[PDB]
Amino acid sequence: NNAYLRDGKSNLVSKVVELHGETYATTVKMGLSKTPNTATSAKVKIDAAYLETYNKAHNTDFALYPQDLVTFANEGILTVNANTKSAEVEMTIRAGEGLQEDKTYAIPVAISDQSSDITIKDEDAKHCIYLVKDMRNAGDAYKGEGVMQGYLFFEVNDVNPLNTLSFQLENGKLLWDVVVLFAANINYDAEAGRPRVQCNPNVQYLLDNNETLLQPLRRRGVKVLLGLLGNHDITGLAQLSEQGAKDFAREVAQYCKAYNLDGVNYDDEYSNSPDLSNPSLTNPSTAAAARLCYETKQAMPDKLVTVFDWGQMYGVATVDGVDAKEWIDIVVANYGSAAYPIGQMTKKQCSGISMEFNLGGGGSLSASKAQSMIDGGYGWFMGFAPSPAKYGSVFSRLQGGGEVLYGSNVAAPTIFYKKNDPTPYKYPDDL
Ligand SMILES: CC(=O)N[C@@H]1[C@@H](O)[C@H](O[C@@H]2O[C@H](CO[C@H]3O[C@H](CO[C@H]4O[C@H](CO)[C@@H](O)[C@H](O)[C@@H]4O[C@H]4O[C@H](CO)[C@@H](O)[C@H](O)[C@@H]4O)[C@@H](O)[C@H](O[C@H]4O[C@H](CO)[C@@H](O)[C@H](O)[C@@H]4O[C@H]4O[C@H](CO)[C@@H](O)[C@H](O)[C@@H]4O)[C@@H]3O)[C@@H](O)[C@H](O[C@H]3O[C@H](CO)[C@@H](O)[C@H](O)[C@@H]3O[C@H]3O[C@H](CO)[C@@H](O)[C@H](O)[C@@H]3O[C@H]3O[C@H](CO)[C@@H](O)[C@H](O)[C@@H]3O)[C@@H]2O)[C@@H](CO)O[C@H]1O
Ligand SMILES: [Ca+2]
């Protein structure tokens, strides 16, 4: 009887927990491959030694969440359920006064004292892990448990991402949970014969000026992602070999670490055919795209790995035996479509609408559409390329939906930002 451990609320082996209050309650669930017998038993425990193994495997440095803040019900004993081939125990995570903001802590949980009828294949199957972030002060985008969330791309060539702050509900909450700096590029470094991250001068300016133009968003609870995009040479996000994907994933994670960002969006577009003789490249395919997503999540497991569903970026649901739910946090679709889940993903990881704010296509976040997306179980609505000059049209496309999603409509904007300028100007007076 093979067993493994995962978070019961999410069914994820590796679960990022954002604390918005003093406690967070879930279950830890042991899955069994066969119906258990009357004597089958197991417990769970915090396994601090496994954190060293985990940090080494991922080249990360997460600190151990204070154990005194984590409590299991029932002495950590798993209640075995023969009918669902599983066993669970309640786990509570308390927010602590010794915690540092903008730091990820780890709770490695292990199966322990299991009965002799249970087989645990490896140390990965023995453990699940919670990656805990205290977000109590980064609350301004948090609109509630289980609500739909916003995902917004800025064309940073033209528009300052501080304009995220122009979008609030009437109750003062910020609309857009996640924003993308669209976009850094993948390009060939001919002199080195390898792919590299290549940043245009507009992208580079934001990174250089991260403290004033990007970190104020993160202070308010907005996740800031680096967009990655193909860029008219032999390299592309769906045509890296296994080694090329490992190398590029390491570079992307270094950008997110160096600049204190929250993850990436991958958009497989505008690349040319690869040079198949280059050991960093391979045939363009969803298998290569999935490999890159998987390797990027392994290099930054606490951060978001997200894809635009375009080109060959999305569709393979397993890499090295690991399901896509573990390494695709959000998938957003092309304007006019809804994203769909693969593997054990649900529609909570999918956009139900994508709105092209610059060209007009893709529909509106109306009361009717909001209700439709909730009824369908979608987790996200996506928008692309808003600009202060078009706020009239943009905000007309956000009426009614906020009342359905949050009990509070989107408010008319009163602030906007000019490119590369940190000053919140008055909208529309300063236009
Ligand atoms: C998610 C998601 O939505 N994903 C995608 C998303 O990508 C789409 O977004 C649009 O993408 C298209 C395509 O972008 C890519 O290609 C362009 C063009 O690349 C080619 O030309 C370059 C030379 O000019 C070459 O360097 C390059 O190799 C390509 O060459 C081929 O083709 C040319 C001929 O065109 C041949 O000569 C070549 O030989 C070869 O065949 C490219 O510019 C883009 O890359 C830039 O932007 C991305 C981010 O978007 C960055 O990551 C890149 O680093 C890069 O930026 C840097 O370089 C550029 C120069 O290329 C610098 O200007 C910049 O400062 C950086 O340094 C992509 O690779 C785009 O065309 C769309 O752009 C328009 O909209 C955006 C806003 O959304 C504007 O910011 C932008 O200015 C464009 O706006 C014009 O068009 C709009 C209508 O489409 C209109 O609303 C605007 O008002 C404006 O229109 C006015 O000007 C027009 C002339 O430009 C004029 O014709 C018109 O009448 C108006 O007067 C947009 O980004 C979206 C779309 O919904 O969906 C998905 O597909
Ligand atoms: Ca705060």
Author numbering: 46 to 476
Authors' account:
The strategy for capturing a native binary enzyme-product complex was to perform co-crystallization experiments with the full-length EndoBT-3987 (EndoBT-3987WT) in the presence of Man5GlcNAc2Asn or Man9GlcNAc2Asn substrates. Two crystal forms were obtained for the EndoBT-3987WT-GlcNAcMan9 complex, in space groups P1 (EndoBT-3987WT-Man9GlcNAc-1) and P 21 21 21 (EndoBT-3987WT-Man9GlcNAc-2), and the corresponding crystal structures solved at 2.0 and 1.7 Å resolution, respectively. The overall protein scaffold and the conformation of the EndoBT-3987WT-Man5GlcNAc (r.m.s.d. of 0.35 Å for 397 residues), EndoBT-3987WT-Man9GlcNAc-1 (r.m.s.d. of 0.48 Å for 397 residues) and EndoBT-3987WT-Man9GlcNAc-1 (r.m.s.d. of 0.41 Å for 397 residues) crystal structures were essentially preserved with respect to the EndoBT-3987D312A/E314L-Man9GlcNAc2Asn substrate complex.
